[PDB]
Amino acid sequence: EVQLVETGGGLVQPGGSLKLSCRASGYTFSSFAMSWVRQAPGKGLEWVSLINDRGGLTFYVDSVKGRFTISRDNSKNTLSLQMHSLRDGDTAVYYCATGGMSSALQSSKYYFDFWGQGALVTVS
Amino acid sequence: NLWVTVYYGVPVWKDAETTLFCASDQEIHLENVTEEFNMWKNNMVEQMHEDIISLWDQSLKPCVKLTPLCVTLQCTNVTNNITDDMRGELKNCSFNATTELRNKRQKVYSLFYRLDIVPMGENSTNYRLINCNTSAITQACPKVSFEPIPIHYCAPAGFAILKCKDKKFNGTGPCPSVSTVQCTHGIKPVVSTQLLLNGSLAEEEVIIRSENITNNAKNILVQLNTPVQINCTRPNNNTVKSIRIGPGQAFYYTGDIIGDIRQAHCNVSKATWNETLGKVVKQLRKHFGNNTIIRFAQSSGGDLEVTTHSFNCGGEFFYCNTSGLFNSTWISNDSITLPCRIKQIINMWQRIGQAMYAPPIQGVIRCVSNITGLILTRDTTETFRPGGGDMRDNWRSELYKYKVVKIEPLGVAPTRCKR
Amino acid sequence: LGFLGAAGSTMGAASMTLTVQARNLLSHWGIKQLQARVLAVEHYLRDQQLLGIWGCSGKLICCTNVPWNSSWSNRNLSEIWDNMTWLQWDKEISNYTQIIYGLLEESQNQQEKNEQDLLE
Amino acid sequence: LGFLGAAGSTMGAASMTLTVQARNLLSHWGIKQLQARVLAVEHYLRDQQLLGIWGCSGKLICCTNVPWNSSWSNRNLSEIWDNMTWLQWDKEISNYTQIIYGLLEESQNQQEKNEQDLLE
Amino acid sequence: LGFLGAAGSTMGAASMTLTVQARNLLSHWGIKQLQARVLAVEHYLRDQQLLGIWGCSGKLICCTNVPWNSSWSNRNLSEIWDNMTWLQWDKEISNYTQIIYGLLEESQNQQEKNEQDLLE
Ligand SMILES: *[C@@H]1O[C@H](CO)[C@@H](O[C@@H]2O[C@H](CO)[C@@H](O[C@@H]3O[C@H](CO)[C@@H](O)[C@H](O[C@H]4O[C@H](CO)[C@@H](O)[C@H](O)[C@@H]4O)[C@@H]3O)[C@H](O)[C@H]2NC(C)=O)[C@H](O)[C@H]1NC(C)=O
Ligand SMILES: *[C@@H]1O[C@H](CO)[C@@H](O[C@@H]2O[C@H](CO)[C@@H](O)[C@H](O)[C@H]2NC(C)=O)[C@H](O)[C@H]1NC(C)=O
Ligand SMILES: *[C@@H]1O[C@H](CO)[C@@H](O[C@@H]2O[C@H](CO)[C@@H](O)[C@H](O)[C@H]2NC(C)=O)[C@H](O)[C@H]1NC(C)=O
Ligand SMILES: *[C@@H]1O[C@H](CO)[C@@H](O[C@@H]2O[C@H](CO)[C@@H](O)[C@H](O)[C@H]2NC(C)=O)[C@H](O)[C@H]1NC(C)=O
Ligand SMILES: *[C@@H]1O[C@H](CO)[C@@H](O[C@@H]2O[C@H](CO)[C@@H](O)[C@H](O)[C@H]2NC(C)=O)[C@H](O)[C@H]1NC(C)=O
Ligand SMILES: *[C@@H]1O[C@H](CO[C@@H]2O[C@@H](C)[C@@H](O)[C@@H](O)[C@@H]2O)[C@@H](O)[C@H](O)[C@H]1NC(C)=O
Ligand SMILES: *[C@@H]1O[C@H](CO[C@@H]2O[C@@H](C)[C@@H](O)[C@@H](O)[C@@H]2O)[C@@H](O)[C@H](O)[C@H]1NC(C)=O
Ligand SMILES: *[C@@H]1O[C@H](CO[C@@H]2O[C@@H](C)[C@@H](O)[C@@H](O)[C@@H]2O)[C@@H](O)[C@H](O)[C@H]1NC(C)=O
Ligand SMILES: *[C@@H]1O[C@H](CO[C@@H]2O[C@@H](C)[C@@H](O)[C@@H](O)[C@@H]2O)[C@@H](O)[C@H](O)[C@H]1NC(C)=O
Ligand SMILES: *[C@@H]1O[C@H](CO[C@@H]2O[C@@H](C)[C@@H](O)[C@@H](O)[C@@H]2O)[C@@H](O)[C@H](O)[C@H]1NC(C)=O
Ligand SMILES: *[C@@H]1O[C@H](CO[C@@H]2O[C@@H](C)[C@H](O)[C@@H](O)[C@@H]2O)[C@@H](O)[C@H](O)[C@H]1NC(C)=O
Ligand SMILES: *[C@@H]1O[C@H](CO)[C@@H](O)[C@H](O)[C@H]1NC(C)=O
Ligand SMILES: *[C@@H]1O[C@H](CO)[C@@H](O)[C@H](O)[C@H]1NC(C)=O
Ligand SMILES: *[C@@H]1O[C@H](CO)[C@@H](O)[C@H](O)[C@H]1NC(C)=O
Ligand SMILES: *[C@@H]1O[C@H](CO)[C@@H](O)[C@H](O)[C@H]1NC(C)=O
Ligand SMILES: *[C@@H]1O[C@H](CO)[C@@H](O)[C@H](O)[C@H]1NC(C)=O
Ligand SMILES: *[C@@H]1O[C@H](CO)[C@@H](O)[C@H](O)[C@H]1NC(C)=O
Ligand SMILES: *[C@@H]1O[C@H](CO)[C@@H](O)[C@H](O)[C@H]1NC(C)=O
Ligand SMILES: *[C@@H]1O[C@H](CO)[C@@H](O)[C@H](O)[C@H]1NC(C)=O
Ligand SMILES: *[C@@H]1O[C@H](CO)[C@@H](O)[C@H](O)[C@H]1NC(C)=O
Ligand SMILES: *[C@@H]1O[C@H](CO)[C@@H](O)[C@H](O)[C@H]1NC(C)=O
Ligand SMILES: *[C@@H]1O[C@H](CO)[C@@H](O)[C@H](O)[C@H]1NC(C)=O
Ligand SMILES: *[C@@H]1O[C@H](CO)[C@@H](O)[C@H](O)[C@H]1NC(C)=O
Ligand SMILES: *[C@@H]1O[C@H](CO)[C@@H](O)[C@H](O)[C@H]1NC(C)=O
Ligand SMILES: *[C@@H]1O[C@H](CO)[C@@H](O)[C@H](O)[C@H]1NC(C)=O
Ligand SMILES: *[C@@H]1O[C@H](CO)[C@@H](O)[C@H](O)[C@H]1NC(C)=O
Ligand SMILES: *[C@@H]1O[C@H](CO)[C@@H](O)[C@H](O)[C@H]1NC(C)=O
Ligand SMILES: *[C@@H]1O[C@H](CO)[C@@H](O)[C@H](O)[C@H]1NC(C)=O
Ligand SMILES: *[C@@H]1O[C@H](CO)[C@@H](O)[C@H](O)[C@H]1NC(C)=O
Ligand SMILES: *[C@@H]1O[C@H](CO)[C@@H](O)[C@H](O)[C@H]1NC(C)=O
Ligand SMILES: *[C@@H]1O[C@H](CO)[C@@H](O)[C@H](O)[C@H]1NC(C)=O
């Protein structure tokens, strides 16, 4: 069984910063690309950021492009996201997900295979 | 859906024949590579063969030619205490030698082995050197040793040598443990016939290698897993003299012998030799039946160069009779002494147009060496006899574990990447 | 990790050692050795010329515009990249190689001509 | 369609067989043959070096930033590419080859320096 | 203005004559001369191969993504480029040559993989 567990932050003031992280187990971490998907309390899903399995390539939705950093650590089976300037509009559940990309010699993905349960980030 | 992607630096190779180079006074394991080896089709053997012969000939290029000695010789019996085994073996020959000045001659006498001279017109008094009717003789330089100094064979860039590490490998087929080496280990170019000397030993068991074991036309190369020590000697104290035969050209010869005249010989331990054969017999029965008979016998015929065990012992050339080693039938502190003949005029390689004179060596000669393998031929009851006339077999016994391949770094494969 | 160390590895792993092998391609008595050095150079240059013709000069991994034909090999990506070694792959597609090379050459000629027109 | 098959065709046709000619540039008794082979390699390398200097490495058709001078040749494009062969053209401008090469080298030196500053 | 004329000039001036030196790298009795020519070619090719591996093929000036470590040399830009000759500089950092070369190779290998993924 694949498990993705978010261990995020809580309530933070507007204009501050908050870091999320996700621990993964049950699969070869290094074989998959990962992403963060956001869900505002009253909305559907939105893609936020995507990172390559080697950690070299990152992509962002324009609305966080100059504010969020997505990173990865393959020795610790850890995915992380550092958010800055925290707008009120960034209140959401942030889900850790596996999928969204694959790399050259692998078959394609372009969908998400596994989901964590999500950390709730609230901006005051 | 998929596109062609070009890769360069791909770890792929093909069998190839290239020129290897020598070096004289590093290994990658290749974890999951299995490769097919085929000794007897190994072109490294041919290169070693040609390099040894070429270098051999180069070493005689600056040496004194003995053509000025193709004269009639008057030969009498030796005035010494000669044992029965040596009767008729040596002759005391007198002749007129050229000297430093063309208008002068000198009378010289020397001792020769009977095998180096041939009577003329059935005249007891008149004899001549064996090579005079055939090609002219050349004296080997006294400053040049015959020591089998090892040679390493190294690949040129773009090529690699693969080494087989399977301890039970019999010379052909897949080898489950293969490593890449930059250059081979040093191989000693020891020259011998029916018994291989100073080679590598098998790691665990006696290994019998043959291109086709059931084809009696093929030679069988047997690698031992234990050495048999052999002690060879020529127990005669030789006094060596020299004369000038030309302008700075010296000729060396045995002047006389101090003390009694005895036959040269080699010793092996009787029990060690018997145990060694027992192991060979045991392995032969894996190719032949179990309830069988294996008989060993002496060489059936041919000249001295193929019916005896030939080797260079301290610079002298010995031709030993091995019938005492191969005389038994195997059905389902003693030693063996092998008498030896000595020759000074030899051909070395199985060639017609060349002949070398080996200068005699001062004093008494003793050499000790290891028997590391045998060359056998085959005729119920199977009979095996010593063989080994072809030198390429000696070199195969060391080169069987190496293969040369060419690196082919370019290749293609499908990926999902497109320009 | 040395020369050909990855030869027994799968294609997707061996592909990470391309510089290890690339660097080991370059470095009368004495003539046969001189001939060997000259020949090694000519061989090397032919492969480099070929990469140039295909538009892959200067790189070890080159993506092209020639589609892969299932008739050359119908194996899928996992089946190839995470299962086969390069020696096995090379044997499988050997017959169809001189077809692939011809296609790569034709593709590059068209690309260079199109680029030239786009620069008018 | 073989090597130099296009030699009698016009420049606009011959320009399509560049790979045919490029691939035919590479491949005591026996020494003079080595001298020829070593020399053939050095010749090849000098041309490749020159393309590198001009910034045309890796391609058979290369556009540059050096303008054409009417003093070298005042023929128009429909004349040169459609009613002339490469052998004829080579003779027509054989006196300006060194001038043109000098200009191409200078152009690239300036181009490399400008790119370096833009990457600051 | 000839070969090595700038050898005594500062690094920031000498760098403008790179084509002068690049063009002077290429062109039993008679054998030792063939050996010298063959080796000159192999030397040349090894340097070109190395530029290829680092992603600098085809150019005399190449920027990379490897940061300069202050431990190799802690001199500032005026000390290195406004004064200092290339001969002096090479001696100053000769002990870090292999470290730098190893880093350049690693950087390019990562660059190639990222580029391949961005095209799939
Ligand atoms: C199998 O291997 C053994 C072990 O290596 C080998 O035995 C060795 O043979 C050589 C002769 O070929 C012996 O070397 C001599 O040793 C004596 C005593 O020190 C020296 O006086 C000799 O010097 C003369 O000869 C030299 C040329 O070889 C001249 O340069 C010198 O000026 C002298 O004239 C010479 O060094 C060596 O001692 C033995 N080793 C042992 C342990 O006995 C055997 O020959 C090999 N068998 C075969 C068939 O190859
Ligand atoms: C080989 O023949 C020579 C020549 O006949 C022998 O030399 C002579 O020996 C006698 C003694 O028997 C001496 O008095 C002479 O002075 C010797 N002559 C010369 C020229 O030296 C020689 O002894 C014979 N050798 C053998 C082994 O038979
Ligand atoms: C060595 O030289 C001597 C002298 O040259 C030879 O002596 C010969 O002896 C007989 C006996 O009288 C003479 O008839 C010959 O005239 C001599 N020969 C000549 C041609 O001088 C002796 O035969 C020579 N030995 C050999 C075998 O060459
Ligand atoms: C090879 O074996 C023979 C025996 O057959 C050895 O000869 C004996 O050697 C001792 C010591 O010198 C003498 O006392 C004996 O009289 C010899 N016996 C015979 C029958 O001759 C010989 O020494 C051994 N040696 C080698 C190869 O060096
Ligand atoms: C080794 O010596 C033996 C003698 O001990 C030689 O064998 C003899 O050969 C003759 C002629 O064929 C036979 O009539 C004898 O019956 C054989 N004797 C024995 C005991 O078998 C043998 O030829 C010699 N071998 C070499 C290579 O010299
Ligand atoms: C690749 O195909 C696998 C099944 O392979 C079967 O056996 C091989 C030897 C071929 O004959 C092939 O055509 C057969 O279908 C699947 O199990 C695997 O999931 C597939 N992988 C991908 C990425 O599509
Ligand atoms: C174009 O060429 C003009 C003439 O140069 C001279 O004639 C040519 C054919 C060559 O032989 C050349 O070596 C001679 O010097 C120059 O005056 C003019 O500056 C050049 N052009 C441009 C566009 O700058
Ligand atoms: C190209 O030139 C053709 C011929 O023009 C005449 O001959 C040449 C060699 C020059 O001397 C020129 O000055 C002469 O007028 C024309 O027929 C053709 O139309 C021209 N092409 C274009 C596109 O204008
Ligand atoms: C920068 O250099 C630091 C000092 O280490 C010394 O220099 C390196 C290049 C080696 O030669 C080493 O053996 C010497 O002791 C390193 O500790 C540091 O990690 C380096 N940092 C970067 C970014 O390269
Ligand atoms: C660059 O460095 C110049 C010289 O600084 C002094 O000498 C060097 C060799 C070192 O030992 C350094 O620690 C010394 O202070 C300065 O004059 C110059 O201002 C510096 N450039 C800049 C932009 O600050
Ligand atoms: C794909 O391949 C189809 C069949 O294969 C053709 O014949 C075999 C024997 C050759 O080895 C192969 O290279 C040939 O292509 C063709 O009919 C089809 O046209 C090809 N399609 C493309 C896009 O190349
Ligand atoms: C030679 O042998 C005889 C016996 O036939 C013997 O009397 C004589 O002493 C021996 N010669 C020498 C020098 O010992
Ligand atoms: C000389 O030796 C031979 C053997 O080669 C022998 O037959 C002959 O009788 C001997 N003659 C003399 C005088 O000793
Ligand atoms: C040399 O003479 C011997 C003995 O008569 C003979 O057998 C051999 O064939 C001859 N060799 C040549 C080349 O004449
Ligand atoms: C013979 O074998 C022994 C085994 O202990 C070895 O030490 C010795 O060097 C070998 N001799 C030769 C000449 O190979
Ligand atoms: C060597 O081993 C191979 C194993 O495939 C076998 O086919 C061959 O017959 C064997 N040859 C000998 C002489 O044992
Ligand atoms: C091996 O030898 C046998 C004779 O026992 C022969 O019939 C067979 O054809 C030979 N095979 C090969 C491959 O040489
Ligand atoms: C050979 O000589 C060695 C000493 O060098 C000795 O130990 C060994 O027993 C001898 N072997 C035989 C068969 O005489
Ligand atoms: C050789 O082996 C046979 C095996 O039948 C044995 O009878 C004989 O006594 C052995 N000889 C020696 C010297 O060990
Ligand atoms: C031959 O004997 C060995 C034991 O030495 C045995 O393992 C093998 O099975 C026997 N082979 C046959 C055909 O009887
Ligand atoms: C072989 O052994 C027999 C005894 O079994 C013996 O009579 C014969 O002379 C020996 N042959 C040789 C060449 O030693
Ligand atoms: C050979 O005889 C000479 C006589 O001067 C002696 O000095 C030398 O030791 C002897 N050599 C041998 C090996 O008997
Ligand atoms: C060889 O195969 C084993 C699996 O049996 C694998 O664990 C090992 O990494 C492979 N070796 C190499 C060099 O790829
Ligand atoms: C290799 O292919 C077989 C096809 O049946 C598949 O079951 C196996 O999982 C594959 N192994 C890898 C590493 O892709
Ligand atoms: C190429 O075709 C031949 C046709 O006989 C076949 O035997 C060989 O295995 C093929 N090689 C491949 C599949 O590359
Ligand atoms: C040669 O000239 C004729 C016109 O006379 C033309 O049709 C033909 O295509 C030309 N040859 C080539 C190779 O272009
Ligand atoms: C050459 O010029 C004429 C006009 O004078 C034109 O009709 C013809 O098509 C041109 N040539 C070629 C070879 O295409
Ligand atoms: C090139 O220059 C020479 C003088 O060296 C002149 O005779 C020739 O006509 C010129 N070439 C052309 C095409 O004008
Ligand atoms: C040599 O140094 C002087 C300053 O001392 C400078 O004016 C001159 O241009 C320099 N020459 C070269 C070739 O760098
Ligand atoms: C270069 O300038 C600096 C700063 O003035 C000085 O310390 C250094 O010694 C000068 N250079 C050389 C190459 O000697
Ligand atoms: C380079 O290393 C040598 C040997 O340790 C040392 O003597 C020398 O000072 C070092 N050079 C530099 C610039 O650090």
Numbering used by the authors:
A (entry chain I): 1 to 52, 52A, 53 to 82, 82A, 82B, 82C, 83 to 100, 100A, ...
B (entry chain E): 33 to 57, 82 to 143, 152 to 309, 312 to 323, 323A, 324 to 397, 399, 412 to 457, ...
C (entry chain F), D (entry chain D), E (entry chain B): 518 to 544, 570 to 662
What does the paper say about this structure?
Broadly neutralizing antibodies (bnAbs) to the HIV envelope (Env) V2-apex region are important leads for HIV vaccine design. Most V2-apex bnAbs engage Env with an uncommonly long heavy-chain complementarity-determining region 3 (HCDR3), suggesting that the rarity of bnAb precursors poses a challenge for vaccine priming. HCDR3s for these bnAbs mediate binding by reaching through the conserved glycan shield to contact a positively charged, semi-conserved protein surface on strand C of the V2 loop (Andrabi et al., 2015, 2017; Gorman et al., 2016; Landais et al., 2017; Lee et al., 2017; McLellan et al., 2011; Pancera et al., 2010, 2013; Pejchal et al., 2010; Sok et al., 2014). We then engineered ApexGT Env trimers that bound inferred germlines for PCT64 and PG9 and had higher affinities for bnAbs, determined cryo-EM structures of ApexGT trimers complexed with inferred-germline and bnAb forms of PCT64 and PG9, and developed an mRNA-encoded cell-surface ApexGT trimer.
